[PDB]
Symmetry: C5
Subunit: 307 residues, 5 copies
Amino acid sequence: PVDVSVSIFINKIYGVNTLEQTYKVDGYIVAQWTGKPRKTPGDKPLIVENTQIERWINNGLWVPALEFINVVGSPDTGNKRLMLFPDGRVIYNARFLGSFSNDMDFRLFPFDRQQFVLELEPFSYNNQQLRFSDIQVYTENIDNEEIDEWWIRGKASTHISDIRYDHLSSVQPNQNEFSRITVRIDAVRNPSYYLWSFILPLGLIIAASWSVFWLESFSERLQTSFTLMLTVVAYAFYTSNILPRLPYTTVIDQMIIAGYGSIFAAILLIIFAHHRQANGVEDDLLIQRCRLAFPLGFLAIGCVLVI
Amino acid sequence: PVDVSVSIFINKIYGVNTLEQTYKVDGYIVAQWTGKPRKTPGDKPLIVENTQIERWINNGLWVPALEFINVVGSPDTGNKRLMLFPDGRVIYNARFLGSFSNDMDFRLFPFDRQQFVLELEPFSYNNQQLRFSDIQVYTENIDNEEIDEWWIRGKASTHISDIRYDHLSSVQPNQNEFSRITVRIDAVRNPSYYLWSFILPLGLIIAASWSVFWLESFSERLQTSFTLMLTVVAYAFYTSNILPRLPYTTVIDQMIIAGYGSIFAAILLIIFAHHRQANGVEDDLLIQRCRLAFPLGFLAIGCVLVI
Amino acid sequence: PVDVSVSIFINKIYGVNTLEQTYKVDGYIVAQWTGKPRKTPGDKPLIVENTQIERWINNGLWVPALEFINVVGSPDTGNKRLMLFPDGRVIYNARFLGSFSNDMDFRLFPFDRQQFVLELEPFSYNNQQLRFSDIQVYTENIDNEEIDEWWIRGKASTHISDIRYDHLSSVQPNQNEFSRITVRIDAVRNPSYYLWSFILPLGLIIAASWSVFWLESFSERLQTSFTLMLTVVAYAFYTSNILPRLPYTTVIDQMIIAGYGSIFAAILLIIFAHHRQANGVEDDLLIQRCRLAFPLGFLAIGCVLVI
Amino acid sequence: PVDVSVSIFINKIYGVNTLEQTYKVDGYIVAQWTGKPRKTPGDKPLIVENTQIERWINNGLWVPALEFINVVGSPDTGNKRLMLFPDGRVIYNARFLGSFSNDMDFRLFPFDRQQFVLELEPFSYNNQQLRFSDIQVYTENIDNEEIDEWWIRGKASTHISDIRYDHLSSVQPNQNEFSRITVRIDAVRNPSYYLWSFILPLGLIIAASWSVFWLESFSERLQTSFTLMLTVVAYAFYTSNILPRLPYTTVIDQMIIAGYGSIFAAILLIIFAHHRQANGVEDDLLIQRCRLAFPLGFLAIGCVLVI
Amino acid sequence: PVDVSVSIFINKIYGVNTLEQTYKVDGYIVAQWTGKPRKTPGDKPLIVENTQIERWINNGLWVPALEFINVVGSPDTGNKRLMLFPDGRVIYNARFLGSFSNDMDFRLFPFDRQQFVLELEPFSYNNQQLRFSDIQVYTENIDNEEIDEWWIRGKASTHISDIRYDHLSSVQPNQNEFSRITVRIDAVRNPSYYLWSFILPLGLIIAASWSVFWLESFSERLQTSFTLMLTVVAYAFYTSNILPRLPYTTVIDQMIIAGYGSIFAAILLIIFAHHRQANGVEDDLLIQRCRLAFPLGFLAIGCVLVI
Ligand SMILES: CCCCCCCC/C=C/CCCCCCCC(=O)O[C@H](COC(=O)CCCCCCCCCCCCCCC)COP(=O)(O)OC[C@@H](O)CO
Ligand SMILES: CCCCCCCC/C=C/CCCCCCCC(=O)O[C@H](COC(=O)CCCCCCCCCCCCCCC)COP(=O)(O)OC[C@@H](O)CO
Ligand SMILES: CCCCCCCC/C=C/CCCCCCCC(=O)O[C@H](COC(=O)CCCCCCCCCCCCCCC)COP(=O)(O)OC[C@@H](O)CO
Ligand SMILES: CCCCCCCC/C=C/CCCCCCCC(=O)O[C@H](COC(=O)CCCCCCCCCCCCCCC)COP(=O)(O)OC[C@@H](O)CO
Ligand SMILES: CCCCCCCC/C=C/CCCCCCCC(=O)O[C@H](COC(=O)CCCCCCCCCCCCCCC)COP(=O)(O)OC[C@@H](O)CO
């Protein structure tokens, strides 16, 4: 078994696609192992770059193909190189840009907390012919400032496990364990834009919709309620334009339905408070004491729905 | 005839395009057959990876080209490899990402039920020179949780048939049957987002539009009806933004037209109930008993249109 | 002159881009000619697939390059193969996905009628060195059902003509005619979605906008007319979102301008019918007999604009 | 110096991107020069197609690389070929699709007038080793009809100049002039869609906004003015959706600001005409003679802004 | 150590992506060094173009691979060439189009001020085997006119530093410093479109929203305030459509929240000024002196928020 020593430099993480559950990672990858000694020009290490490699693999050089398990498609490999030392140690340094995929959960959308996973594994050699020895992850480049959409919380967490594939039991018994290296990078979303432009004006609209029970007549209450319902529909549209598509509801999509519920409960209370008549002429004030309590009632419903 | 034994690992299914009727599949494919015995280095199986293959096919190795019948374009083949055993059995394992196409029917859109089909066939060898022996489909990776947009219902259904092409009757008589392997994966859409954000507020808007016959005068009824018609137009827009394009109407696009019909029937009833005058001064109440029945009338029309 | 016999299998036609006037075609293409006799392994025909070909053209095999005249870019050629028979007849079967271009006329948009053209021609050999003999087009796969956006009406129409290029008169006199094969596939758009969701509610909005002359006062008429004008602007937006961009107006964009004209003629008639006063106190009813005639007037204008 | 004779066939021009200032051109390019005599099979000219060429350049054939100066990226070169005549004259015919770039000025947007430029130059050989002799441009295919978005006005204008690069003064004195061929194709935009759907309804909205001074009271004037301001905002949105992004204002974006100015001047005049009171009870009519003059005033401002 | 002399010609800078913080650069790059003397055909310099190079590197020519440190993916390298002089000096001239990345700060969005950075470094050779000698940047092509979205302010600023990598301390002690060349190009956004179409009508809407305290009754004030709140929501949508996505708020997104605050403070003042009653019949005028001061109050708040 050859002991391969990986090191992954993560330059940047971006492009989080919420519907495909993918995200783009750009960085380097440096594998290193020890083979047979060789004679190079002089004593200095020989460096082979890009297209030169395929001239060395045809001459019998052993270079494994380390694939990313959770990549989507194929990484756009830029430069790559092989450094060979007279001692017999080879270093394969390549540069990748990949559209990786994970199982993400956006169910608390502006106050999100995701983790980004990179999985790596030999494509053909099991852990009796190629095993990983360690892994270092360097994420110095990725910053924590207000400008970035994701705050990276702490260093990466690496892991070296042994996956088992039962489907190779028919063609290769007793040797089907593959050595896999995992990398997890935690991240928290930047909730500033979604707190100032989506939560606060929706709160103001819901809080100002309650002040239609101060109007005196009944037709004014109804016409004002219909104007407010058109306002809430236009606001649901404005949030539906500048937002990421999802197959499940976010926090803001609970708040929009809370706005619809407040508007419809106001319309129901208006019709009920008008409709308390003996034959059609008797006015009413009793249920219209809900100018200070039905706000507190639906605010209690919302604060319970938070908890 | 060579007996080829296929196995397809479906990693993920996503990206359903409703207008082109395509969907992206990502996974592996492992074909396996038995050829001539050979002498490899030692007794262990020889592994050829990526670019090495085209150096073996030039030396006369027989590797068939299995194409996907319903793919669109060409799959983005990532890694691939050939494992050759001294016995004489060869294993071709490749990784694909393809934009497959099927005949989908989105006519009940949020409560949809689709099936995803992968068809596979030799590109050149008919079933007298290459026939498939079996196929196993492994879909362990694809989960059924709330987060995924599609729930996969049960395992895949495989099939090995013999397609006949009559157009090769002129150049190759008596041998035109091609062995094809089919794979069907059933799936149901996740209707939660389309039930909470599109059906419920539209139901509330249609139900609150009926309470314009509680207003006393006639001009207030008309102005309120025009405000409600603008509300329904803004709602049709809001659903037209966050939705998949189709050449036929969905369920939600029947509900929008039901909202238009309710608004226009309310306007017609308002004009008719006002217009019952002898010369222009006689008021009316008789047809305005439809504050409790015309709701039930259009609800009966809608519940019949469901059935 | 070599007699080449083409056959084109059209698998699917989709992706009609209205602004670039392109459309994507996916299918096969099978050319066939007769060369020199040869000795193959045994008597059976030898099959060369994919990358093998470029090893045969270097050894002097004559394979012409048939290009698509109206393609945009280069087709994404998938698999391809050459079948050589001891007799001396060669068959070149390839698979293409191309973004073809034509001169389309969307001036009657929902009730459209287009035709899809595929043009094919040798890239270098004129009709004294390579002429086409026939062409069969097989479009069995393309269905006529409600689900498809385009109904294909009848089989394809093929044509073999001889194009003349005068610009080769300076370098190649007397031989500049190139043999071209044309293919036309007629298609009609599916107008169901554009009849139920765009024509009917716009008709209802225009028909309900006429009932503002039933209101009694003058300020109510004006305020209601301005609400209706905002409704028509929101509807023009809703159609502008879910529609294909064009540099000329469709039928629906005549109907939107008809709605604007109806709203503005209603506002003009309202101002004129109020403004018939001797000094400012005299009411009017005479021009307000247009609650039953100005509908018929603008409906006559619309029905004339249809014819 | 070798005399190269270029000829460019422009098949189609489309895809004008207003923000990147690019546009896509699709067509052919035929260069032609005279080298050494050679012996071909027979006397007939030998034709080399596609991949064959790189087998001839390795054998010492001299084929220059003519690059497009203003292209963005690299053209998607389709087929290409070399025709060699026993005399010694070579013809290189290739097919390109490129995303070219120019300096465009959309400051009069619907009534635009652009020109499309193709610049061509040898990549390495200066005008002492390779000079262009002439150029013919054939644009027969591009039509002038209503369907096309751009009307091509007259034939192309070609030019052969000698660019000087001073930065090669350090490595190559006395020889730094490069022979460049320029091609200009004038084009005018089709203003029909932007005249019927954007100028006319905006004119109608501005002209109907002036008739709020016919209302009697003061609160009705203000509420109607606010409804009209919402109408103008919705119209600015409708034009902002179906339009090309720009970093400077168009003609239509002057008309939208003119609509905003008309609405705000109406609100200012309403507040001023109401606010002429001695203590709060005195009515006014004097400044309300602007129902016929303030239309003419802002129309004079607009007609001056045209000139 | 080989002294490499770089020169970068920036043709165009465009395509600024605000969410990925990338931008596209298109231009040339000319490296130049001095190797061993050689014998070329004649005395004139030999020119190798495109695919010829990989035939020279296999024959042992030393051409380094200079990579862009901050590129995303791999540049779309077009043409490239090597000019070799009998003296022994080699010139490598290539053409790139790259999607570069930087740390951009859009926190003052229409009045922005960015800088575009290009970083360049040898991929494998440290500064004991390859060091850069100088760099000239030529940006003559990029203009400062109104048409361009970015005004380039002054020439580029270049820099040659020595980066240290500690992770190579295990495999290469005492030699880990890499010579890097940096290029900065300052740019200012064109704020004309965002000053005429977004700041001025929003200012007019906020300034006209203050004139609801001129209305006499109380229900008219509330209904007008709700119409104005719907106007501000529609305006926030119109700015959210034609704008670049960001994870932090811009200046215009402070102005939208200022509009929401003005509307809600008007509603609060209306409810408070009505609600000053002894039991429900007492009118009020005292707090309604804020028709001239609450404008100045919120304008003072805004002008303080500017400073
Ligand atoms: C002083 C006297 C004291 C009297 C005491 C007064 C107390 C009276 C109680 C009122 C109950 C509150 C109802 C008001 C509804 C408030 C709305 C609300 O907060 O609930 C949200 C919206 O619900 C909604 O729109 C639901 C629509 C509401 C429409 C009608 C409102 C209530 C009227 C029904 C009357 C009974 C009918 C009789 C049937 C029993 C739920 O979030 P959502 O679904 O997005 O998340 C799903 C997500 O979890 C999916 O994963
Ligand atoms: C106590 C006294 C008892 C009296 C008894 C009272 C009974 C009176 C009956 C009313 C009939 C109901 C009409 C109301 C319309 C309700 C609307 C409705 O439910 O139908 C939907 C919308 O239709 C629509 O908008 C149609 C537009 C409706 C506009 C007018 C409504 C009715 C007024 C016409 C009056 C007669 C005219 C005289 C001509 C005969 C159809 O879905 P849609 O098309 O999307 O699917 C197509 C998809 O299948 C394509 O594949
Ligand atoms: C009982 C007494 C009997 C009296 C008799 C009553 C008869 C009175 C006649 C009215 C004429 C009808 C005018 C009403 C306009 C109706 C609107 C209409 O149908 O025409 C469409 C829209 O036009 C429009 O918006 C045009 C805008 C209309 C705005 C004003 C309407 C008429 C008012 C002008 C008054 C005269 C002015 C004085 C000047 C002569 C044209 O489609 P569009 O362009 O999209 O296609 C272009 C496409 O072909 C480009 O390729
Ligand atoms: C019978 C008695 C006779 C009395 C005589 C009556 C005469 C009274 C004169 C009125 C002046 C006209 C003002 C009306 C404004 C009309 C609006 C207008 O036409 O101008 C456009 C919009 O301007 C605008 O929105 C500007 C906003 C207008 C808001 C207020 C309107 C006028 C009120 C100010 C009062 C004075 C204030 C006191 C300060 C001196 C300019 O296009 P825009 O910028 O897109 O192009 C920029 C592009 O060139 C960038 O490259
Ligand atoms: C003659 C008598 C003299 C009396 C003296 C009169 C003086 C009375 C003082 C009023 C204070 C001004 C409040 C008016 C709010 C004006 C609104 C405003 O200018 O602030 C902006 C919006 O704030 C907002 O919408 C905030 C929402 C405002 C809603 C209510 C307004 C004030 C009502 C609260 C009353 C007290 C409540 C009691 C609790 C203490 C802040 O930008 P934004 O966040 O986008 O940037 C965040 C970015 O920096 C993130 O990086």
